[PDB]
Amino acid sequence: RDFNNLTKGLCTINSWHIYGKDNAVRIGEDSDVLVTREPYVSCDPDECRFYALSQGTTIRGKHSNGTIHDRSQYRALISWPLSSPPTVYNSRVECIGWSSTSCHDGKTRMSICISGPNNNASAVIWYNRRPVTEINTWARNILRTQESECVCHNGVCPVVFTDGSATGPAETRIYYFKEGKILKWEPLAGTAKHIEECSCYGERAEITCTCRDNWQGSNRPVIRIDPVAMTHTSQYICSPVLTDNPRPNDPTVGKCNDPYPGNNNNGVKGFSYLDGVNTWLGRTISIASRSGYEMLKVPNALTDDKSKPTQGQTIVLNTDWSGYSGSFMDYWAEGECYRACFYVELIRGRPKEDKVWWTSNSIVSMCSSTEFLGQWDWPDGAKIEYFL
Amino acid sequence: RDFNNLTKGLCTINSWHIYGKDNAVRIGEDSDVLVTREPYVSCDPDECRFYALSQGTTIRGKHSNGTIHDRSQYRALISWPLSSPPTVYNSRVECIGWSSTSCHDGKTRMSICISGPNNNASAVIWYNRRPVTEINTWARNILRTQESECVCHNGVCPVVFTDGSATGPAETRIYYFKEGKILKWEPLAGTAKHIEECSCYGERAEITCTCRDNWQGSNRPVIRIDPVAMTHTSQYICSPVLTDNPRPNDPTVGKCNDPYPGNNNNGVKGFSYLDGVNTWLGRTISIASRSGYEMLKVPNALTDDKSKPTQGQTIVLNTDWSGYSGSFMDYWAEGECYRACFYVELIRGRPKEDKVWWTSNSIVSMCSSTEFLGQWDWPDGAKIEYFL
Amino acid sequence: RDFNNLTKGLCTINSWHIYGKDNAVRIGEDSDVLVTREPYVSCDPDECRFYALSQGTTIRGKHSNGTIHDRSQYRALISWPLSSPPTVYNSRVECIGWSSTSCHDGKTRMSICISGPNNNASAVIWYNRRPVTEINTWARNILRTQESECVCHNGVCPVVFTDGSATGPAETRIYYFKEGKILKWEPLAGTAKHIEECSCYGERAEITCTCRDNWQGSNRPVIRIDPVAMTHTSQYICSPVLTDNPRPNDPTVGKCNDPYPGNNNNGVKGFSYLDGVNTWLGRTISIASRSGYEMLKVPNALTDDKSKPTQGQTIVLNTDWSGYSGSFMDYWAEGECYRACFYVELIRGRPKEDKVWWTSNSIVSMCSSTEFLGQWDWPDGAKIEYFL
Amino acid sequence: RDFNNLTKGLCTINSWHIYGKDNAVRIGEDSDVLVTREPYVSCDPDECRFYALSQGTTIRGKHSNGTIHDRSQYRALISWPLSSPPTVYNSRVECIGWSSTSCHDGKTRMSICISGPNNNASAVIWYNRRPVTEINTWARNILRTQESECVCHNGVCPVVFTDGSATGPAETRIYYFKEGKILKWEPLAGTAKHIEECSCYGERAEITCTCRDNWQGSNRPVIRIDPVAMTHTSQYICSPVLTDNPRPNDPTVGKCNDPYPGNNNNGVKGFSYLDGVNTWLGRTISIASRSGYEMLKVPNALTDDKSKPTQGQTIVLNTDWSGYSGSFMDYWAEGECYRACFYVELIRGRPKEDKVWWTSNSIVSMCSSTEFLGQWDWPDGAKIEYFL
Ligand SMILES: *[C@@H]1O[C@H](CO)[C@@H](O[C@@H]2O[C@H](CO)[C@@H](O[C@@H]3O[C@H](CO[C@H]4O[C@H](CO)[C@@H](O)[C@H](O)[C@@H]4O)[C@@H](O)[C@H](O[C@H]4O[C@H](CO)[C@@H](O)[C@H](O)[C@@H]4O[C@H]4O[C@H](CO)[C@@H](O)[C@H](O)[C@@H]4O[C@H]4O[C@H](CO)[C@@H](O)[C@H](O)[C@@H]4O)[C@@H]3O)[C@H](O)[C@H]2NC(C)=O)[C@H](O)[C@H]1NC(C)=O
Ligand SMILES: *[C@@H]1O[C@H](CO)[C@@H](O[C@@H]2O[C@H](CO)[C@@H](O[C@@H]3O[C@H](CO[C@H]4O[C@H](CO)[C@@H](O)[C@H](O)[C@@H]4O)[C@@H](O)[C@H](O[C@H]4O[C@H](CO)[C@@H](O)[C@H](O)[C@@H]4O[C@H]4O[C@H](CO)[C@@H](O)[C@H](O)[C@@H]4O[C@H]4O[C@H](CO)[C@@H](O)[C@H](O)[C@@H]4O)[C@@H]3O)[C@H](O)[C@H]2NC(C)=O)[C@H](O)[C@H]1NC(C)=O
Ligand SMILES: *[C@@H]1O[C@H](CO)[C@@H](O[C@@H]2O[C@H](CO)[C@@H](O[C@@H]3O[C@H](CO[C@H]4O[C@H](CO)[C@@H](O)[C@H](O)[C@@H]4O)[C@@H](O)[C@H](O[C@H]4O[C@H](CO)[C@@H](O)[C@H](O)[C@@H]4O[C@H]4O[C@H](CO)[C@@H](O)[C@H](O)[C@@H]4O[C@H]4O[C@H](CO)[C@@H](O)[C@H](O)[C@@H]4O)[C@@H]3O)[C@H](O)[C@H]2NC(C)=O)[C@H](O)[C@H]1NC(C)=O
Ligand SMILES: *[C@@H]1O[C@H](CO)[C@@H](O[C@@H]2O[C@H](CO)[C@@H](O[C@@H]3O[C@H](CO[C@H]4O[C@H](CO)[C@@H](O)[C@H](O)[C@@H]4O)[C@@H](O)[C@H](O[C@H]4O[C@H](CO)[C@@H](O)[C@H](O)[C@@H]4O[C@H]4O[C@H](CO)[C@@H](O)[C@H](O)[C@@H]4O[C@H]4O[C@H](CO)[C@@H](O)[C@H](O)[C@@H]4O)[C@@H]3O)[C@H](O)[C@H]2NC(C)=O)[C@H](O)[C@H]1NC(C)=O
Ligand SMILES: CC(=O)N[C@H]1[C@H]([C@H](O)[C@H](O)CO)OC(C(=O)O)=C[C@@H]1O
Ligand SMILES: CC(=O)N[C@H]1[C@H]([C@H](O)[C@H](O)CO)OC(C(=O)O)=C[C@@H]1O
Ligand SMILES: CC(=O)N[C@H]1[C@H]([C@H](O)[C@H](O)CO)OC(C(=O)O)=C[C@@H]1O
Ligand SMILES: CC(=O)N[C@H]1[C@H]([C@H](O)[C@H](O)CO)OC(C(=O)O)=C[C@@H]1O
Ligand SMILES: *[C@@H]1O[C@H](CO)[C@@H](O)[C@H](O)[C@H]1NC(C)=O
Ligand SMILES: *[C@@H]1O[C@H](CO)[C@@H](O)[C@H](O)[C@H]1NC(C)=O
Ligand SMILES: *[C@@H]1O[C@H](CO)[C@@H](O)[C@H](O)[C@H]1NC(C)=O
Ligand SMILES: *[C@@H]1O[C@H](CO)[C@@H](O)[C@H](O)[C@H]1NC(C)=O
Ligand SMILES: [Ca+2]
Ligand SMILES: [Ca+2]
Ligand SMILES: [Ca+2]
Ligand SMILES: [Ca+2]
Ligand SMILES: [Ca+2]
């Protein structure tokens, strides 16, 4: 119809209710489920779907051996119906590649997949299910993008890309696309020192992205974008409640414009909702690995270097495997506010569960409630032993 | 289009004709069929579908071991095409949870799923495939609902919930929703002493629900709701023809305002059509277990404590397993009256058939005919031995 | 839109071209294909589909053992996309039963399924995917119908039913339905002595049905119906070219108003296009069993008791299994005439191939061409040994 | 809507970006994927799909033994969603046969399948999913067609057919169809000596086809068609860069009006984009077998007998199997020019990999970019050993 505009503010988050869960690994033990990783959720005006990077093989398939690897010629961005597992028969390929992002502008969808060898990758921007623009690697070192949905405002959909080192300074660019065409791009600015896999959402004509500083920060870098002026800023979440992984233990005061030290060259895709007192941070419970997952209300986390939790909700027990997590919202729902949502990737197999030769995941997703709901934990649920 | 109004009365039931059957267990012996239980049927203005609570695994899958349990993080309400089995590839998830209800108001559908641990469950009310309202447990003891379709009148769709004990008094509430929002709720009133899993239908601007008194009654409690005044009453079916299970033998006189004694703390979801002489009761043939199923015409059953059968129709032989049963009607069919329909859940596996480690079911469904049709019996049809 | 009217005459049949083939048995050797029998083809204004009576199990499934039986509680009329096999995941159930017919009136479709025990069966007439009318057995001996499509003219869709003996006189009725409601019914009249499984088609406001005289005739009975006057006549195909099976050898002169003797109490569903010189008869090559299949042009076959073939086309070699065959046409195609089409059921398994415990089939279908096309033979193609 | 007209010229090809890949063989190792060969890609105004000739069996199925054969009664043209594999459950049969072509005219699609024994084959032309015209073999020696999409201009869709010898002169005809009806046909003219499997595309009201001279040429014959005058010409690509296979080594000067000698009675379906300096040729890297695949920019290749490459892009390494390749374009995309695309069939199994008894393939497809993108190689990716 018309391009969607971010006219609403976030709803008050008082708790999180269950939104979707596909139990992919449980089901795929005896059904034709594709091996995946790097999942996310994204809405169209009339439907919300699950997204992920397939590995081009079923879990039970012999070609599942080796899927711990991130980039191959057999990966593709696929989408499928909410809470269903990604099967060979219900998955729709959006594009070919090993890194992606996707978002609906209100009229139609833009999907981006990057493929190629490490020193010669390229991004192909699809719009209305047709290829429209291509961008070649500028740093010739694994051109990569968000791994979760982008956000649009009046046709303009900003996307964050990084090309270059994962263990030192890299070259990050913010591209402003409209109908798949590049309107503008700018190099990253601000105090964020390294940017990867940004998790974004929008409200009141502003897009907020919580990313990953793989190089040095255990606190998470944040990029705020103005889709109209097509400009941005960057900093770190100030709060001493650290949210990357692995990470050092929580201090009493964080860092606003520098990476909090203690762990280098590693991290995990993550997210947060930075809205004054209505601020909630997601993070693995373990400071050592992708284990467990919790939501913590940290009022003014982005700007207050001593902010600590005031409420919380456990999503996955520390005795269960978690993984990537990112933001998305149904910008086409009724009501006066945007309901914050998120997904957590539940990784199974390698490297933590090496009795199997594969690596995959299932998805659990929640959205905010203004009620103060009881909590439950949501594990992947599969028994690795069944796969032996 | 416009909200549906219950303007018609029930058609004269002179017999029951076969409506749908999915032979799920038979087929799933060698195909990717999801393990389920607590099924029902529900119509949209242009299509009628099968519904159930998946267990998040296929029957042949190794994760089928243990599906005798009712509440887990791997269950979800799914719907699929009429008479097809619930497969991994054709099932649509309506919401995540282990207790549900769903109904179309004429414009769009409302689905409700409850999830969580026993002392901290919550209901999420979906409307137009989007989450709209959430209700937290009020008694912190397995918040639960109908397990069959709700009914709407001019946008207002009442739903019966129970929170609290299954073996003593509990807290039942009737919620009046419109477009997924709570218009009002009231505590249960009348003479029904315990309410669970209500089976409802509507005609002439009135909704009738036949429920389950798990605590003491072998006769079935009945809740009649006025969707306009948003008020209700409750009593028991007076007739000495008892319809819960397990149950004592049939007496010569029933009880109108108290549970008929003889069996405590147990029961089965069931239903009835209470329409003067056009009254028909469904029930298992066995008074000991979920075995067999029959329809009995008992004129004035609700109000006559000595009413006995005048006609009948066998649905499932006493030598075959039955289970839950509930009401639904296609409120969007042609004609001058609403054709009463019902489904019977045919449970296979545990606990009755313990040679297998799973528990599932298939569905058989019938609707009324004004003709006096010959009868047949409709078993699930699978051979457990094939699964050994 | 509007009800379809049979305003065109048949196109000149100079040969037959391949229309559809699903290779169901070949494919189902390693995929979830439903066991079926009694197939046919039928068109909607915008799509043509395959139809059949499922046995409620896959071919590879253990429940396939025993599918040689015709009537069970696990059968249903299903339809699926043209030339695809009937799989668990792509088959749509039209109704529950072990005998059926179906046809589109131009506005919507009417489907009829008969179910029940031999002495108490009933037909349920569905229209617009909703049950509308029910007809109870009148002779209490396997109420049964066409097993191929019916035909409509201005909303009126006649259907031929038989109730009673298969080895002596029975009670045949012609029902005239409009929107699933019975407008009228009449007992069979004319000289046909026994009627079963009629194969019908329409042109120039007249419906012609070629049926099966199971009792005594090896020539085929014919019922011509006037859908406007709602009246009919019946006789036998006069031609000495006999088309039932099993059957005696071809004589030099046939019988117009009596069954041609030689074989009693047996037969096979078959068809023909009776259009003056443009007359073509279908039949098995073997006079002993459902083996092979051929089309023979027999000018004036219906009215000329000495008519012999003038052209022919082999469809299935006598070294391959055939089975039922019937007529259908796409009444919604472009052009000035109706293109005659037909299907042949290719039965595999029992009783001819008893190394397997099942019985199923695949479908081959052709339509007429005004060209004189080269011919090929179209076997089912599966290797029974693969199933051992 | 309206018939599409070839009003645009080709976009400047500066490189090729990944468009689609189904990894069919990898996935089909453990899922119900149909055995195929002779694939292609073709767009409708609102969707682009993969096409191929199924062998009527799954890869893992026992009936896969023998699929090295090209013509059987079990083959059919099927289409399925872009980048998905051709599965039993997602494949749509367009028609029955062992040779085909298909194209959308802007209003609807025309599909053509040829079937029959070698000396009696026939083509059936389908339009709007209905059979419309039939053409009988004129040379009674394997009537055959393109094996890739045809192209339309204002309703007129030319198709190239060949009937007769594959090792000597044959009878090639160009048919001009409009709405499935034959408007005209002409015998091949010009200097091309043998024509097979033409790969076509259109721009500026002209259709260019790069075909295969199976008889003597290692250079490729070219047919240019005027869809308005309904006339054509034929010649060979002049360039010394030879593109058939097997083939002799590249000389320094090619042949414009005669087959370049060195290899007789063999070849492979291939293609090219002949657009002045914007000319690109596709070809296997190996001169001995269907191994590897590369794109080479050869300015003025069609008319310059000494033209050599100026740029190139590897598509498949010479250490991986390739096969057929052809052209297609999305004539319904936005923009001022038509983006050239192509697919490469990646054959697996027999005859090169004879450890398995089957022959199949997967598909890789690319489209042009005006950017100068980095390249990667795209193998089928399956491990034959897994199939042993
Ligand atoms: C039914 O459902 C309801 C609804 O869910 C249940 O009630 C919920 O209960 C939750 C658990 O009690 C509760 O969540 C906690 O909230 C605390 C905040 O509330 C408290 O403080 C404020 C401020 O003074 C008060 O207003 C309020 O009244 C409370 O007292 C959080 O502080 C909790 O989070 C911390 O603890 C958990 C352990 O449970 C950690 O996993 C988490 O990371 C937090 O602690 C770490 O981080 C802080 C900050 O840096 C450190 O100070 C601390 O030492 C920990 O650090 C270690 O661990 C981390 C992570 O491993 C590591 O990185 C670091 O290095 C250190 O090693 C928690 O979020 C909900 O708010 C509450 N909801 C409601 C509405 O009440 C109810 O119980 C259920 N009913 C039943 C019967 O079960
Ligand atoms: C072809 O098709 C047609 C159509 O279906 C077939 O005809 C149908 O035949 C049915 C079976 O005969 C028949 O169903 C029965 O109807 C009886 C009512 O009709 C009779 O009574 C009235 C009133 O005086 C008359 O008008 C009428 O003419 C009849 O005489 C019911 O009473 C029957 O139900 C009872 O019996 C069955 C056993 O078959 C029980 O399973 C059922 O629960 C009922 O009996 C129990 O309950 C009563 C009430 O409390 C007790 O009094 C009784 O002792 C039983 O109690 C024990 O069992 C229950 C359940 O296990 C347990 O809870 C309790 O504690 C006790 O242990 C039955 O419904 C259809 O009406 C009839 N339809 C038509 C249109 O005719 C025809 O046969 C078929 N043809 C062929 C050739 O097969
Ligand atoms: C490429 O493609 C084209 C197109 O298909 C191929 O050409 C086709 O070739 C067909 C085979 O030759 C041919 O079909 C035959 O046509 C005969 C009719 O044509 C002839 O007669 C008329 C009249 O005088 C002439 O106008 C005409 O020129 C011909 O001479 C039919 O008579 C044939 O059918 C009979 O034979 C077959 C055996 O092939 C039987 O299976 C069939 O049942 C018919 O014979 C039985 O029935 C008759 C009638 O009662 C009996 O008289 C006879 O004895 C047989 O009876 C026994 O068998 C039956 C069945 O088993 C049993 O019930 C009974 O009791 C007895 O035991 C046949 O139909 C096509 O017309 C022709 N098409 C065209 C356009 O030319 C071409 O060959 C192909 N090219 C190549 C290179 O292969
Ligand atoms: C990141 O990505 C970019 C983008 O892809 C990568 O850069 C690309 O690199 C490609 C490989 O170097 C390059 O492709 C080559 O281009 C050559 C043309 O360019 C050159 O010549 C012109 C003219 O003078 C100059 O303008 C230009 O600057 C270059 O110098 C082609 O000639 C190449 O093709 C030939 O070589 C390959 C071997 O690689 C053969 O497979 C191919 O068939 C061609 O050679 C055969 O054919 C010719 C013509 O007849 C014969 O003369 C020759 O002897 C060969 O013949 C034998 O082999 C064939 C086939 O087997 C057989 O039939 C015959 O009988 C003989 O046996 C090649 O296409 C891209 O243009 C370039 N793209 C860009 C934009 O730069 C970059 O490297 C990547 N980065 C990294 C870090 O990897
Ligand atoms: C393009 C790409 O390879 N992304 C990979 C990403 C990357 O290596 C990291 O961000 C350092 O740059 O890491 C991970 C990961 O599970 O940690 C998975 C992604 O597949
Ligand atoms: C929410 C829930 O657990 N419902 C369960 C219900 C419940 O235990 C009973 O109504 C007593 O309260 O019983 C049964 C049952 O087969 O008998 C199945 C349901 O899964
Ligand atoms: C309703 C029914 O059973 N129809 C059966 C029909 C019938 O027995 C015969 O027409 C004699 O009446 O025969 C056959 C058959 O393969 O020959 C199959 C049908 O399933
Ligand atoms: C109609 C037909 O059989 N086409 C076949 C084609 C043909 O034999 C050749 O063009 C010589 O005429 O060859 C090949 C091939 O892989 O080389 C495959 C096709 O199936
Ligand atoms: C998987 O691959 C490894 C490495 O190639 C090999 O050694 C191992 O045996 C394989 N595992 C399986 C189950 O094939
Ligand atoms: C199912 O689980 C039980 C309990 O854990 C175990 O003892 C049993 O062996 C399992 N059954 C199967 C078939 O695995
Ligand atoms: C099929 O059933 C028969 C009859 O019950 C039995 O004797 C036979 O062994 C079964 N065949 C198979 C393969 O189970
Ligand atoms: C395939 O067929 C050949 C030829 O009929 C036979 O000799 C071979 O054993 C078969 N291969 C398999 C795996 O069955
Ligand atoms: Ca980090
Ligand atoms: Ca009870
Ligand atoms: Ca399987
Ligand atoms: Ca007979
Ligand atoms: Ca050649």
Side-chain angles (χ1 to χ4, degrees), chain B residues 13-308:
Chain B
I13 305 153
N14 284 151
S15 54
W16 304 89
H17 76 257
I18 185 61
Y19 178 69
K21 194 180 190 307
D22 65 5
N23 300 290
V25 187
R26 266 169 71 75
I27 295 164
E29 185 275 324
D30 177 60
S31 82
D32 300 338
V33 170
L34 292 167
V35 166
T36 62
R37 259 222 66 209
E38 294 88 29
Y40 52 107
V41 187
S42 191
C43 298
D44 283 7
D46 62 331
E47 165 187 27
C48 295
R49 295 163 66 84
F50 276 3
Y51 287 71
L53 288 179
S54 167
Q55 284 276 20
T57 176
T58 50
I59 314 183
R60 275 302 195 184
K62 288 181 184 184
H63 301 276
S64 67
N65 184 359
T67 49
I68 194 208
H69 299 299
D70 315 312
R71 309 173 294 290
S72 82
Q73 290 98 325
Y74 324 114
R75 300 207 82 171
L77 169 67
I78 49 161
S79 78
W80 64 94
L82 207 76
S83 290
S84 260
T87 72
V88 177
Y89 322 121
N90 72 163
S91 300
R92 179 212 284 158
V93 185
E94 305 295 341
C95 47
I96 308 293
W98 38 251
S99 182
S100 86
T101 187
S102 183
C103 49
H104 202 284
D105 62 17
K107 288 190 165 163
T108 195
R109 177 165 291 268
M110 170 180 73
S111 283
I112 302 174
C113 285
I114 290 152
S115 80
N118 296 354
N119 69 3
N120 236 351
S122 56
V124 181
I125 294 91
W126 290 68
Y127 185 77
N128 202 14
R129 320 208 123 264
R130 293 184 172 99
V132 174
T133 310
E134 307 80 43
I135 303 165
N136 194 226
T137 180
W138 49 91
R140 342 230 340 154
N141 192 177
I142 312 180
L143 171 65
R144 53 214 187 257
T145 189
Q146 304 178 192
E147 316 300 3
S148 74
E149 82 164 16
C150 30
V151 193
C152 309
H153 184 256
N154 195 28
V156 183
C157 315
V159 180
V160 182
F161 292 89
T162 297
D163 198 338
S165 192
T167 61
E171 298 182 35
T172 296
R173 298 182 173 183
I174 318 244
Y175 275 76
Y176 299 84
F177 296 104
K178 177 145 157 168
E179 282 174 42
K181 300 195 201 78
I182 293 151
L183 295 183
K184 176 189 177 183
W185 78 255
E186 12 159 50
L188 161 76
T191 51
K193 299 317 183 296
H194 196 262
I195 292 286
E196 282 187 345
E197 307 171 325
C198 290
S199 284
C200 316
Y201 68 91
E203 44 84 38
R204 308 238 184 248
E206 197 205 1
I207 294 160
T208 302
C209 298
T210 305
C211 324
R212 157 189 184 168
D213 177 332
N214 196 249
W215 180 22
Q216 334 170 267
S218 277
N219 44 342
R220 290 191 177 282
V222 176
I223 287 161
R224 256 120 108 231
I225 304 173
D226 184 335
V228 173
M230 298 188 318
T231 55
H232 78 280
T233 63
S234 87
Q235 75 169 86
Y236 282 88
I237 293 169
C238 292
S239 178
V241 178
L242 308 177
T243 68
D244 207 340
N245 172 274
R247 62 175 184 268
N249 277 297
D250 281 352
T252 74
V253 46
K255 293 216 164 260
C256 295
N257 296 107
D258 266 304
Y260 190 74
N263 284 264
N264 310 334
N265 312 163
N266 208 0
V268 68
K269 180 184 163 62
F271 79 100
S272 74
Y273 278 90
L274 313 168
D275 192 33
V277 297
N278 195 39
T279 290
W280 283 81
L281 316 180
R283 81 179 174 167
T284 63
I285 294 188
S286 174
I287 68 170
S289 52
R290 298 160 177 192
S291 182
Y293 204 89
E294 66 185 352
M295 282 312 296
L296 296 166
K297 184 185 181 182
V298 182
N300 304 309
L302 177 67
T303 58
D304 181 352
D305 63 3
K306 286 178 179 196
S307 49
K308 288 300 191 148

Side-chain angles (χ1 to χ4, degrees), chain A residues 263-293:
Chain A
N263 284 264
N264 310 334
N265 312 163
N266 208 0
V268 68
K269 180 184 163 62
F271 79 100
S272 74
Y273 278 90
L274 313 168
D275 192 33
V277 297
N278 195 39
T279 290
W280 283 81
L281 316 180
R283 81 179 174 167
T284 63
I285 294 188
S286 174
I287 68 170
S289 52
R290 298 160 177 192
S291 182
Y293 204 89

Side-chain angles (χ1 to χ4, degrees), chain A residues 9-74:
Chain A
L10 300 180
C11 298
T12 304
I13 305 153
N14 284 151
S15 54
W16 304 89
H17 76 257
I18 185 61
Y19 178 69
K21 194 180 190 307
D22 65 5
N23 300 290
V25 187
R26 266 169 71 75
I27 295 164
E29 185 275 324
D30 177 60
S31 82
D32 300 338
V33 170
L34 292 167
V35 166
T36 62
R37 259 222 66 209
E38 294 88 29
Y40 52 107
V41 187
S42 191
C43 298
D44 283 7
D46 62 331
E47 165 187 27
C48 295
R49 295 163 66 84
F50 276 3
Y51 287 71
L53 288 179
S54 167
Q55 284 276 20
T57 176
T58 50
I59 314 183
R60 275 302 195 184
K62 288 181 184 184
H63 301 276
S64 67
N65 184 359
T67 49
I68 194 208
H69 299 299
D70 315 312
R71 309 173 294 290
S72 82
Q73 290 98 325
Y74 324 114

Side-chain angles (χ1 to χ4, degrees), chain C residues 383 386, chain D residues 62 65-66 357:
Chain C
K383 273 205 194 218
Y386 284 165
Chain D
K62 288 181 184 184
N65 184 359
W357 284 96

